[PDB]
Design goal:
The complex is a heterooctamer, with four copies of chain A and four copies of chain E. By secondary structure, chain A is an all-alpha fold. Helices cover about 70% and strands about 5% of the residues of chain A. Helix content of chain E is about 65%, strand content about 0%. Chain E has about 70 residues and is mainly α. Chain E has a single domain, classed as Histone, subunit A (Orthogonal Bundle), CATH 1.10.20.10. The chains are: A mainly alpha (about 80), E mainly alpha (about 70). Strand 1 of chain A pairs parallel with strand 1 of chain H, so a sheet runs across the interface. Chain A binds a DNA duplex (121 and 121 nucleotides) through helix 1. It is classed as dna binding protein/dna. The entry lists the keywords subnucleosome, nuclear protein, DNA BINDING PROTEIN-DNA complex. The assembly is decameric. Cryo-EM structure of human subnucleosome (intermediate form).
Chain lengths: ~80, ~80, ~80, ~80, ~70, ~70, ~70, ~70
Amino acid sequence: ELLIRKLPFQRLVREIAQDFKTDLRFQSSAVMALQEACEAYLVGLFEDTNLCAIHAKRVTIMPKDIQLARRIRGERA
Amino acid sequence: ELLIRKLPFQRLVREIAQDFKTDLRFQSSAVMALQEACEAYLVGLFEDTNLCAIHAKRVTIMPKDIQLARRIRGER
Amino acid sequence: ELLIRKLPFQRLVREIAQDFKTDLRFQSSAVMALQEACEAYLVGLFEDTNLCAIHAKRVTIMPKDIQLARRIRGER
Amino acid sequence: ELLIRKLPFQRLVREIAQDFKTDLRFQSSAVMALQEACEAYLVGLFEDTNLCAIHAKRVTIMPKDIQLARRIRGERA
Amino acid sequence: DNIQGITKPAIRRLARRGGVKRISGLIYEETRGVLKVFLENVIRDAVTYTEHAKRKTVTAMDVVYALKRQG
Amino acid sequence: RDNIQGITKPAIRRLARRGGVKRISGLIYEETRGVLKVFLENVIRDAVTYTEHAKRKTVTAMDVVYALKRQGRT
Amino acid sequence: DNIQGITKPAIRRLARRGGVKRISGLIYEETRGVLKVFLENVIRDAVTYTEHAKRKTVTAMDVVYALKRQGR
Amino acid sequence: NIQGITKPAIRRLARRGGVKRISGLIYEETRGVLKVFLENVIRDAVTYTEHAKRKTVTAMDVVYALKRQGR
DNA sequence: CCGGTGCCGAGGCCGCTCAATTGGTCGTAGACAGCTCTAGCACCGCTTAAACGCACGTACGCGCTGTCCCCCGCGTTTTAACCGCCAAGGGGATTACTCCCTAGTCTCCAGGCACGTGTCA
DNA sequence: TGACACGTGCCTGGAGACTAGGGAGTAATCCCCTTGGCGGTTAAAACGCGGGGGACAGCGCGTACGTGCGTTTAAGCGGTGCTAGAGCTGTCTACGACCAATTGAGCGGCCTCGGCACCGG
């Protein structure tokens, strides 16, 4: 499908977890669940950012549009 | 203090209730609670619409701003 | 906006209404309201029929697809 | 008669209830009510999935049939 | 006949907006029947509401209430 | 007239001023009223459901709080 | 877990009653997920009613209100 | 690391999201946003793991964790 | 008291999208009059926040009654799982069809709007 | 009694309908590996009965407590009219920035093996 490549994603996941905590075990079916959720989240965020961009009489989406989406959703940003 | 009057708000609430179920009596602390929640909701909606307006090159709020805010909020 | 011409729709609506009741008049904003609702209903139904068609090997939508969509919606 | 056993159904119901609030006790007519409603829902869903399968010039049901039925009915899928 | 005023290209345009790429010839008669049924049902309810209120003028609110109560 | 007209224009303007809005199109007010009306209807519908469960004829403050609590707060 | 108590022959029996003649192996997991979601939603509402009445035993009326308030 | 989320991958996600034109600075911005998201989710997941003390994260545990993070 | 799985780490041939590069086209930043509509000020108004009098329906708490849900003993008992033999079938490929989207030409009517006439709460 | 609603009428430019057209999706057909269905069987979860026991649902009843209509007023907030003045915007010039297209490659993935960690049967 349109999923991100497994091994670089896994390496990032293991790297970040190593910074959060040490020696934790993470299984394969756990990472695919996280990846489906992450890509769904990012695709939806890009949908809303695009809607904000089109609202602004533009065709190209900007970083500030993303920041607005995160501000209106109530997320700490 | 509350920025919306009491008696017209109460009348509206009672009118709507009359359609869902007839012969209902409210309570004072119940209507004030409902009114505080409603006014808080509108103030918040007005903040985001204003934020959407400021985002745009315009300076005044427009109907499309309210509609944009509610779709992105996930309410409509 | 609207995707169906105003005057023929109005003529059709008044004709059908005449069989329910005699000597009735309709407001303009009432007819415009009915058209927005009608077009939204048909577009949504056409969305679902297409989804049913895509589910099948044929990309093209068929009359039997609409009847399945209406049956599954619980209308008939 | 009921097509699903009471006790495995009851155990599942209690497990889900246990996460909202502990120490809750259930009533017999409450579990039987939930079971009649649940089986009626599934039997109807099985009718609709089957109708979608037969529509597709097939003989058996597929996972895509369930997902299609829920989208056209109006559930989130 | 007033049902024929809902032209084939109008229904096609609605269908295009619905995302369909190819359209069978038999859809049009089917669509017309469905539309007629819908209109009949809604208007039947609308007039019912009007009569209950002992009024002679169908109002915008009558239609809105009819539409709401018909899902 | 209608009860919806009892939420006057200066009240909505005052709410908007507190919300930081400096200029308001004339069509905002009617638009705001529609949104508000929908919200109130939805909340009260739930409130009455709670009232019926308690076999009471008086809607209490607790009924309203639970209705508000259940509907998604964001 | 207790979700595994909804055994394969029980789901098959429900499908037979629903008019199903042949059933893919993947149906069972799909059916279980749908069923679990349904149960969660209803019970969540049911317990809410129970808590409002300040009782500790879920009553038949709690379930009926939950079912009513969950449209098809 | 964060650089494994390549520019063409983010572009593909945006294409699926309906975006026609993409500013060059979005990509670095998107990466930062993603990192924050991942950190938060994993923090909760490990918390659940420690409460169970199984020390092996169950796949079902993560799905519930992911669900509650979203809502 | 040992174990089976699952991840960790490494080695390896292939293999294809990515970073780099150049060529290129269009979109947004600022303005400025054209045109618009909104807050401010002044007049006039009306209705509600209060406020006890009056009558009162009932929400809530305490006590009595029963009642049924939990836990265990139990036993027999009935059906769910695993595996092999059997046969039904979903799908990709091949071949033939027909009709539906493009496009041009002919035809046709919806609306501003202007006027006149009519009506019901 | 008055402002909205219905029936006629002019004229054009945008919209509807028919025909010539052809190719691509649709439909019938066959192999074939894949995969549910039936059967044999045995053992492990279940249903009903009763001790047995008490937290708790439901009913009866007393009380005061806020619910609601009613009456006075009055002044502060709301509607209406005129106005000076701030605000939305299309294309003007033009500037850069992503989109298109080509290549070597290095990490992504598959096939295989040695080895450790640990709650559990």
